[PDB]
Design a binder for this molecule. Structure first.
Ligand code: CA
Length: 610
């Protein structure tokens, strides 16, 4: 047993029992290019007399062990204290983990998570990966100078005990080359677990979408450095919610998450770099800037579609102070579509925040944490019972995850770049193998495409009857092509060419892809479509395919947003053209090769069983 200082790797590699005393801090060393360290140990504590144990993680955190909760208490470079609580729910065992990045240009946040366990080392649940931004002094301190320590905060009768098993630290190397933007792109997502042999089982179990997708260092070697850490954990009984809780010191959470959605930038990439290295000139900074500027005018976020339009066309606006409004006007006129994309996303994020936090100000939203929930990519709604004080980011897959290692596509007025007919077929294979089917063509603006393909298909406000809300697609490219452009003209009235996208939905949704012969503008559409799906509109986890409004010689598919948010989109090879904007689709331009992969799903014409 340990009644003083110790050596964790030596003493607790298999088992050691700490006789926690108040008034005594039992300390240990933690000594052992680019990569991740995963410190791990399995705990069984005894705090039966209401003892509270305090485990100092070097200089950056403190874990408090109470009988019914594991509490983490953080200290970044901000100085201010941030506290969290994880419920044990009667569990007597638990794992303590934390992930430290090492490198010259590695991330500047450490992660800390607990797992509740049964007697037999089976996962019962997992905590959020609590992320904590730390200074360069703190980052330099690993792996060689860092220490761990155990103590009891309170004086009680009885004897506080902490039995540690299977203490260890494992390294995993960053991949060779890999553009830094991409290399660490999963540091702030659930997929971080995929870098970790013990836990790679869990993420794959939850999503099913596999760790195959993303920069998850497939070829990496999860290697031990010291002690004897647990090597593998079994998939739990029920599916756990994998989630990362991320903080923003600058109080720019809405700006950041908006950038993330609009531009498809890793939340990690929008955080302190060790080596500053503006390469976010094209999308990142503008989008964030729009949110800041919009906030400064105090305009309701729901009115934004109107507002942006007015500022584009020199129509008045209800702002008392003209200076912030003008700052916005200027930025809006320079990039009216990107302004429209940016504040659309921000609007959705903020609407959700208020649903979890009634009467909360944008200013408050800006200082909230982001809770990146990797959804159980199957059932229905992941984000559930928000911890109040978080912006909930639901992580489903994105088109970009299915693209080759080649130079990533981009959406110019000349057209889609680095996108040939080979990459589409190869990317179509992956989507098939991964259990998706083509649902239809989608036409969007250039900036709309970067949003959808890289940031993912996220719900946006729309000037649509609340009932008919959803992502619109179409079997016939002609119908989608109508919308492959800026939604409206700038101050000169110019409408740029856009981009043609291919939306794919998951195969497992096929029973829920309904079809009617009745026009969607027909009065009795709402009732008939409701009869087909089992509830009144709007559309949840189901699609609807029917005749477009008017005579309309084509079929329009509306994906419900819940389905849409699980849907994925890649670039079509059907080009738009800068000279012909406003014309119909010239069918010469649609290749046969792409036509052959665009067979449509077998729609259902009868309500599901009851
Ligand atoms: Ca692995």
């Amino acid at each position: 047993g340990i009644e003083g200082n110790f050596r964790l790797w030596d003493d607790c590699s298999s088992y050691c029992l700490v006789y926690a005393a108040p008034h005594k801090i039992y300390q240990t060393p933690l000594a052992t290019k680019e990569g991740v360290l995963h410190y791990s140990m399995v705990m069984k504590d005894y705090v039966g007399n209401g003892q509270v144990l305090a485990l100092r993680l070097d200089d950056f955190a403190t874990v408090f062990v109470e009988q019914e909760s594991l509490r983490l208490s953080l200290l970044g470079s901000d100085g201010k204290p941030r506290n969290f609580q994880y419920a044990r729910q009667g569990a007597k065992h638990w794992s303590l983990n934390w992930l430290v990045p090492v490198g010259d240009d590695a991330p500047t946040s450490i992660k800390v998570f607990f797992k509740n366990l049964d007697g037999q080392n089976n996962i019962l649940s997992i905590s959020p990966l609590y992320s904590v931004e730390v200074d360069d002094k703190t980052l330099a301190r690993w792996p060689a100078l860092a220490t761990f320590s155990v103590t009891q905060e309170n004086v009680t009768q009885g004897q506080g005990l902490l039995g540690i098993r299977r203490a260890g630290v494992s390294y995993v190397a960053a991949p060779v080359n890999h553009d830094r933007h991409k290399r660490w792109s999963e540091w702030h997502s659930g997929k971080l677990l995929c870098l970790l042999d013990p836990l790679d089982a869990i993420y794959n179990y939850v999503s099913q979408n596999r760790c195959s997708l993303g920069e998850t260092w497939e070829g990496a070697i999860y290697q031990t450095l010291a002690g004897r850490p647990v090597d593998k954990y079994a998939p739990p009984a029920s599916k756990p919610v994998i989630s990362q809780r991320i903080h923003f010191a600058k109080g720019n959470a809405l700006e950041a998450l908006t950038s993330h959605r609009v531009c498809g930038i890793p939340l990690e990439s929008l955080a302190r770099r060790r080596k500053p290295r503006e390469e976010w000139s094209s999308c990142g900074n503008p989008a964030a800037n729009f949110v800041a500027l919009y906030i400064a005018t105090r305009l309701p976020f729901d009115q934004f579609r109107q507002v942006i339009h007015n500022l584009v066309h020199g129509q008045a606006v209800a702002a008392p102070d003209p200076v912030p409004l003008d700052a916005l006007r200027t930025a809006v006129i320079e990039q009216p579509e990107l302004a429209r994309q940016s504040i659309a996303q921000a609007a959705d994020i903020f609407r959700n925040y208020q649903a979890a936090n009634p009467g909360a100000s944008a200013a408050a939203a800006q200082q909230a944490d982001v809770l990146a929930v990797t959804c159980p990519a199957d059932a229905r709604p992941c984000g559930s019972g928000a911890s109040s004080g978080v912006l909930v980011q639901r992580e489903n897959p994105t088109g970009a995850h299915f693209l080759n290692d080649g130079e990533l596509p981009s959406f110019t007025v000349q057209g889609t770049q680095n996108w040939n007919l080979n990459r589409l077929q190869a990317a179509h294979l992956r989507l098939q193998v991964q259990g998706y089917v083509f649902a239809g063509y989608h036409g969007t603006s250039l900036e709309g495409a970067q949003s959808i393909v890289f940031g993912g298909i996220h719900n946006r406000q729309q000037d649509l009857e609340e009932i008919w809300r959803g992502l619109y697609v179409a079997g016939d490219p002609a119908l989608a092509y109508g919308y492959a452009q800026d939604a409206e003209g700038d101050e000169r009235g110019r409408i740029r060419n856009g981009t043609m996208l291919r939306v794919y939905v998951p195969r497992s949704a096929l029973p829920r892809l309904f079809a009617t012969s009745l026009p969607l503008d027909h009065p009795g559409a709402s009732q008939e479509v409701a009869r087909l799906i089992g509830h009144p509109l709007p559309l949840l986890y189901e699609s609807i395919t029917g005749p477009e409004a008017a005579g309309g010689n084509r079929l329009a598919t509306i994906l419900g947003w819940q389905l849409a948010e699980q849907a994925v989109a890649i670039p079509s090879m059907i080009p738009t053209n800068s000279r012909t904007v406003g014309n119909p689709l010239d069918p010469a331009t649609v290749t046969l090769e792409e036509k052959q992969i665009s067979s449509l799903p077998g729609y259902a014409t009868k309500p599901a069983k009851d």
